[PDB]
Design a protein around this ligand. Structure first.
Ligand SMILES: NC(=O)c1ccc[n+]([C@@H]2O[C@H](COP(=O)([O-])OP(=O)(O)OC[C@H]3O[C@@H](n4cnc5c(N)ncnc54)[C@H](OP(=O)(O)O)[C@@H]3O)[C@@H](O)[C@H]2O)c1
Ligand SMILES: NC(=O)c1ccc[n+]([C@@H]2O[C@H](COP(=O)([O-])OP(=O)(O)OC[C@H]3O[C@@H](n4cnc5c(N)ncnc54)[C@H](OP(=O)(O)O)[C@@H]3O)[C@@H](O)[C@H]2O)c1
Ligand SMILES: NC(=O)c1ccc[n+]([C@@H]2O[C@H](COP(=O)([O-])OP(=O)(O)OC[C@H]3O[C@@H](n4cnc5c(N)ncnc54)[C@H](OP(=O)(O)O)[C@@H]3O)[C@@H](O)[C@H]2O)c1
Ligand SMILES: NC(=O)c1ccc[n+]([C@@H]2O[C@H](COP(=O)([O-])OP(=O)(O)OC[C@H]3O[C@@H](n4cnc5c(N)ncnc54)[C@H](OP(=O)(O)O)[C@@H]3O)[C@@H](O)[C@H]2O)c1
Ligand SMILES: CC1=CC[C@@]2(C[C@@H]1O)[C@@H](C(=O)O)CC[C@H]2C(C)C
Ligand SMILES: CC1=CC[C@@]2(C[C@@H]1O)[C@@H](C(=O)O)CC[C@H]2C(C)C
Ligand SMILES: CC1=CC[C@@]2(C[C@@H]1O)[C@@H](C(=O)O)CC[C@H]2C(C)C
Ligand SMILES: CC1=CC[C@@]2(C[C@@H]1O)[C@@H](C(=O)O)CC[C@H]2C(C)C
Lengths: 250, 248, 257, 243
């Protein structure tokens, strides 16, 4: 079972931590006395978040501002974050490029950036953080969505990026479960959450602060997948036993 | 009915070797207009015409190049004066390997295996809109479930499902009468695949055939594996519920 | 004297902010910690700008993409931007329709599009902002040109719309003095500036030194912050001097009675 | 015997110009919206020795009318020597609030219609090596309150017609363009709308004189003081400098 003391003194990265769920996660991590490095584009808002993390009781708290459209930044960020903390125990991959509910016409650039920020940068950040996490026997936490497990209209490019996370990180999970690499991988399937962006872009939305905690919890407990939706009807059918079998079979 | 492919205008990517080739042959034998592509093609074009192909042309190039991909569909459209079935089959080359460091291969996989299919589809959309046609996406078990050794690949095929399943439901809620067929294929007896992977491997001829059948029939998904125990279990009933459920 | 701190936490709009001078202005405003909302038609290039402004230290940075051919968009843009920032201090009217130096024959559609985008939308945007500007005792910054003060060939439709800005905004400036509305109106008269667009359009026909866009942009903002009536900016100091019109300031000060 | 168009010629300075033009034995086509007052002007023109005199009614809100008006007036006279653009939309003195309609309408009638009318006349004018006369205002060279929309339209004329004047200058196109900056004039419209006002009858003459003499600009005010100031030598320098 989960105890907030499991995070005390743990060295933790939170991406897309300036707004929404990622911010809540940083604050939670702080109140559990964790070393935290937050990141996002907003140089200004990030510093505001760091100050609040120290007040809430972070062992330490830094920011590095940048955009995850830049794969170079992502490599460097992990190196620099590891320097500021003296290691890394948990990498939380939460950031997304902004997406709207729209029928797809011909916007190939939106598909491309979506795939870059929402998927590729996670692989880059993963690669850079893997030495430290192998050493700490750490966790990678991937934030995904219902839209990454089931099809919904109006969100194709986004959905395509969330499906890839599952495909790529689940394949890696198995690869770590045989090469003995003792890093856990936690895919989080979230329903609608009551963040500013989500509401001002669109069902019942679950509370952001409780959501953030469930992500941290699942990651701390080293769970393979985490589900969180405002409904229990939703959450229960999102699991898929047919897959567990096929996988176990081969 | 093999008559449904009579005189229809079709593109087949990755049609130089393996399944894409067999798809061209079967399509030639039903007398369809075909434009094949890859980077051996002429040898393929010969056999196609002499099997009963209404018209068989080619355009060689790399689907690494998105500009090439956008032009190809137009040029192939010029060459046939319209389009009824776009078949997306090509993939960049993959060796079974523990993913360690290869961000290059990850990025190229998303480009060729996923991103090009989207470019091709944008280009073909006008012609397919008028012809009330069909898009056929060749995917894999690895686009439905996880396997080690193939992460980059799995991610690209997963990407296809997320994307094309999403625009499928979009077209229903726009009445755009273009069908979308995701082909979930188990191990097939193609040249390259055998020289990369123990398990029973299905025959490439019934595969190519099966794919085309499903595309012609406008089936949402096509399953095909040398194990019939699996094929029933590879379908996901849990998912179909939730999609119709949230359809509110 | 102007202090970069003057703009910190000030809520600002910049139109035409995807390229050239508008882009540079947004950047400068970001460095100074301003709340910024940018606009133009291209949402891809606008997203790039918003990212950079956040990196550079914008208090906030949004965009809203649309054409200023649409007066509905312009009237709405301000509302949405006002919402995003919780007010408005400075309105910077920078965008123009695309125009290429060509002798005028019969192109009335160009002429009408030039008055629409270059002049009319500015009026629309101003009307929309004035309520929020009144409250903050804010500023309107109107970017014009030498071709808005003197005649040049090949750019008639353009010239006419720029001249028109002068007549109109100069008139409501005097209105606001009398009515005691405390909103400043800064008209910026610029020579050739080394923006990508300008160079591509003048390159093989016009011989002159182009002033730097980065400096140009900073001048406008300073002029607007210091609530100056006119800002002049050309690479030649001869030009910047003989641009002002004293005889006109007399005539205006005469009829003030 | 010169063929001339006069727009906004039902009253005020337009009407007075029509009279002077008739009294010099010129062929004249007048226009405005009101058919009734136009009929009256056509006759008084016939009385004063007009070589010919007809009217065509219509609103210069309509660019189709303007385009076709110049065509019809040109056929009716078999050519054109002088185009006098004088008309304006009805404008009051008011602090501008949010009435974008007035602003849009002002640029349409007062500036945009003039361009259309000009474009239409150009072949006939090139043929006669004729003249465009644009009536403008103090408020088109300097800023006054209460008249924002109006001034904007007048400024626009200056910008536009001064640019094309330098255009025709290098194309060698032999059509003169005369910009007329007028102070307050004692027209009925003007009056209803505490300074001294010049006489409408002399002003009209001054406009006609300047256009006949192919002057670039004409100034006219009830004050010798203003007229001297209204000129801009800084402008002439950089205009000629950047040449
Ligand atoms: N909200 C929901 O209902 C919901 C549901 C399911 C899954 N999720 C997942 O939860 C995660 C976050 O959701 P959210 O609602 O919290 O999103 P959000 O509130 O919009 O926050 C997104 C974060 O990413 C940052 N960001 C945006 N563009 C970036 C870029 N190019 N490089 C780096 N950072 C960038 C943003 O900060 P800056 O703008 O300052 O850069 C912000 O901190 C995402 O993975 C999303 O897919 C959310
Ligand atoms: N074989 C199986 O067991 C199996 C199982 C499940 C799914 N699938 C799927 O079925 C499809 C066909 O696979 P396959 O085994 O037939 O493959 P294959 O025999 O290796 O054929 C690959 C095809 O793609 C072309 N290609 C390679 N790189 C390309 C590029 N950059 N741009 C454009 N074309 C390129 C190749 O032509 P060139 O070499 O001349 O360029 C060739 O025609 C694939 O989508 C695969 O994922 C296959
Ligand atoms: N560069 C010079 O030498 C110079 C000299 C004197 C005066 N100026 C003045 O400075 C200002 C900016 O000039 P610049 O050279 O920086 O211009 P620019 O680089 O051409 O930028 C024009 C901006 O306006 C936007 N725009 C164009 N058409 C639009 C429309 N229909 N609706 C909305 N936005 C539109 C463009 O974005 P999208 O196309 O993506 O919408 C772009 O962001 C103008 O007012 C110009 O008159 C410039
Ligand atoms: N009055 C002054 O003190 C003064 C001073 C400086 C400059 N100016 C300029 O001198 C010119 C003459 O002014 P003014 O005082 O003579 O004016 P006015 O006496 O009111 O004459 C205006 C003329 O324009 C016509 N008109 C109005 N709306 C029209 C429309 N939509 N389409 C076509 N014609 C239309 C009127 O005819 P209908 O009403 O019958 O349609 C009338 O014949 C104007 O360009 C003005 O700006 C005047
Ligand atoms: C039905 C549904 C679709 C997806 C989203 C809402 C909800 O989960 C959420 C998600 O990222 O999963 C938040 C934003 C929204 C997007 C449509 C932009
Ligand atoms: C277990 C299994 C994994 C995937 C593949 C074999 C089989 O389907 C096939 C596929 O693409 O689906 C062909 C190539 C191969 C890859 C490991 C390279
Ligand atoms: C002589 C001269 C004329 C005007 C311009 C160049 C220069 O200032 C500049 C302006 O907007 O003022 C930029 C674009 C250009 C136009 C001719 C298209
Ligand atoms: C101070 C002054 C302003 C302009 C006008 C009077 C004078 O010239 C004249 C003009 O058009 O030039 C006539 C109408 C009037 C307007 C205020 C309505």
């Amino acid at each position: 079972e989960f105890r907030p003391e499991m995070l005390q003194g743990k060295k933790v990265i939170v991406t897309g931590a300036s707004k929404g769920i990622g911010r809540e996660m940083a604050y939670h991590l702080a109140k559990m006395g964790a070393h935290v490095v937050v990141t996002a584009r907003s140089k200004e808002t990030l510093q505001k978040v760091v100050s609040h993390c120290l007040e809430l009781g972070a062992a330490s708290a830094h920011y590095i501002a940048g955009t995850m459209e830049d794969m170079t930044f992502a490599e460097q960020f992990v190196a620099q974050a590891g320097k500021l903390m003296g290691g890394l125990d948990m990498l939380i991959l939460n950031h997304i490029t902004n997406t709207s509910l729209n029928l797809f016409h011909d916007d190939i650039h939106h598909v491309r950036k979506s795939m870059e920020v929402n998927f590729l940068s996670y692989v880059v950040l993963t690669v850079a953080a893997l030495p430290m996490l192998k050493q700490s026997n750490g966790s990678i936490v991937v934030v995904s969505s219902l839209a990454g497990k089931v099809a919904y209209p109006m969100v194709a490019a986004y959905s395509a990026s969330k499906f890839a996370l599952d495909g790529f990180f689940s394949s890696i999970r198995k690869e770590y479960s045989v090469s003995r690499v003792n890093v856990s991988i936690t895919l989080c399937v979230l329903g609608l959450i009551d963040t500013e962006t989500a509401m001002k872009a669109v069902m019942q939305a679950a509370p952001k602060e409780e959501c953030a905690l469930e992500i941290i919890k699942g990651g701390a407990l080293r769970q393979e997948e985490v589900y969180y939706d405002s409904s229990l009807w939703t959450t229960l059918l999102i699991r898929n036993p047919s897959r567990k079998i096929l996988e176990f079979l081969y």
